[PDB]
Design a protein around this ligand. Structure first.
Ligand SMILES: *[C@@H]1O[C@H](CO)[C@@H](O)[C@H](O)[C@H]1NC(C)=O
Ligand SMILES: [Ca+2]
Ligand SMILES: [Ca+2]
Length: 411
């Protein structure tokens, strides 16, 4: 009802098509005494209308927010499933390849020590799943016992009761060391990465449940439907206006920025540790190759030991493609918590525009990101001394996981 008409027709139709009584709409433009939210002036909105539209806009913002969150959560979840499943498959496939090829290559050497290898793979598996062990001692034990058994089997003629320190003549060659280093780096790398994906996923899932405040509700009502109430339903909110409003509403969520970026940075970094620097494939799916090399070494050092007294890394593999895609997706969503207002405004709510008093230009500067930066926010009045607890706990989770990944990166 501008341009020389006070008829509330369009406000009536819009308010009605939104599932509210058409009877509640005043026939013509009335006095605005009653308005709790919209600036007091001549309006087509009654109390019931204002409240209803407030509820509507609030619910709409909620829907948008949880939709975006749902997208992000879906992405992280699919990433998690993909990487976990692929690491497990690499290990399992290594084991199957060993079981299938070793009897031909080594015969009784392998077949009478199969449980040793199976046990080693089970230990590696437990180690990946997070059970608290480490490979140095486990592999050391493995190689000790394996050397014992293999030496016994090589020499049925001599009965050998017990303490063979002839080792570190390196009967198995360099393979035990290579396996030690590579497995130590790669498996904790993989585990920490997967753990990081899990943590990010849980953080998003939990943050999504943080409710919008009353201040935010009123500011959003003012942002969206106060244009309708003040006689300009065709008017749409100014981008910077919308952005200040949402920055006011989503300050707590925006406080996750620093630690989210830290976590995602360390997660991008840790993927490098999946491989070595020598142009060799990942040990996570090629343990059997090093085992086989160790056994070959032992065989061709059988005489010498007796003393009584790794295929090149493919240009592209599954893991590498997965890592590229993952790094793309993670670099893409590192800005999430502060990009929320911009994207939510750009997509849905937001060239002469509604500044919240009237149609026109919106002067005020866009606020910075984060709770503290909203102390002066003109559109939303936010108390900065009252942070949300859920957000804080999630930030702690991000801190912890990040530390885990930095340590994992170092070792
Ligand atoms: C790897 O093998 C274990 C042991 O049977 C199994 O539980 C797990 O589902 C397998 N993972 C795969 C096939 O991705
Ligand atoms: Ca982005
Ligand atoms: Ca203030």
């Amino acid at each position: 009802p501008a341009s020389k008409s006070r008829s509330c027709g369009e406000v009536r139709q819009i308010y009605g098509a939104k599932g509210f009584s058409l009877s509640d709409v005043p026939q013509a433009e009335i006095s605005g005494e009653h308005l709790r939210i919209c600036p007091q002036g001549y309006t087509c909105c009654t109390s019931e209308m204002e409240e209803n539209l407030a509820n509507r806009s609030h619910a709409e913002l909620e829907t948008a927010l949880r939709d975006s969150s749902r997208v992000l959560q879906a992405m992280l979840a699919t990433q998690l499933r993909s990487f976990d499943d692929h690491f497990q498959h690499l290990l399992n496939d290594s084991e199957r390849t060993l079981q299938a090829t070793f009897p031909g290559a080594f015969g009784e050497l392998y077949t009478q020590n199969a449980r040793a290898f199976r046990d080693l793979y089970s230990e590696l598996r437990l180690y990946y799943r997070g059970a608290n062990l480490h490979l140095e001692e486990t592999l050391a034990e493995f190689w000790a016992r394996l050397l014992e058994r293999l030496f016994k089997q090589l020499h049925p003629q001599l009965l050998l009761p017990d303490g063979k320190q002839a080792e570190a003549l390196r009967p198995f060659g360099e393979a035990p060391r290579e396996l030690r280093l590579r497995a130590t780096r790669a498996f904790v790398a993989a585990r920490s990465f997967v753990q990081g994906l899990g943590v990010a996923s849980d953080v998003v899932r939990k943050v999504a449940q943080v409710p919008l405040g009353p201040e935010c509700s009123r500011a959003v009502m003012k942002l969206v439907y106060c244009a309708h109430c003040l006689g300009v339903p065709g008017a749409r909110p100014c981008p910077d206006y919308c952005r200040n409003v949402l920055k006011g509403c989503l300050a707590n969520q925006a406080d996750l920025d620093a630690e989210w970026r830290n976590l995602l940075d360390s997660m991008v970094l840790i993927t490098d540790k999946f491989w070595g620097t020598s142009g060799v494939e990942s040990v996570i799916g090629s343990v059997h190759t090093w085992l086989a090399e160790a056994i070959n070494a032992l065989q061709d050092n059988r005489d010498t030991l007796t003393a009584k007294v790794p295929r090149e890394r493919p240009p592209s593999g599954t893991l590498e493609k997965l890592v590229s895609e993952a790094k793309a997706q993670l670099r893409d969503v590192q800005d999430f918590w502060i990009s929320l207002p911009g994207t939510l405004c750009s997509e849905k709510m937001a060239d002469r525009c509604w500044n919240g008093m009237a149609r026109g230009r919106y002067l005020p500067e866009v606020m910075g990101d984060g709770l503290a930066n909203q102390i002066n926010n003109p559109e939303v009045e936010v108390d900065i001394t009252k942070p949300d607890m859920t957000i804080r706990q999630q930030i702690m989770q991000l801190k912890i996981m990040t530390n885990r990944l930095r340590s994992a990166y170092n070792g």
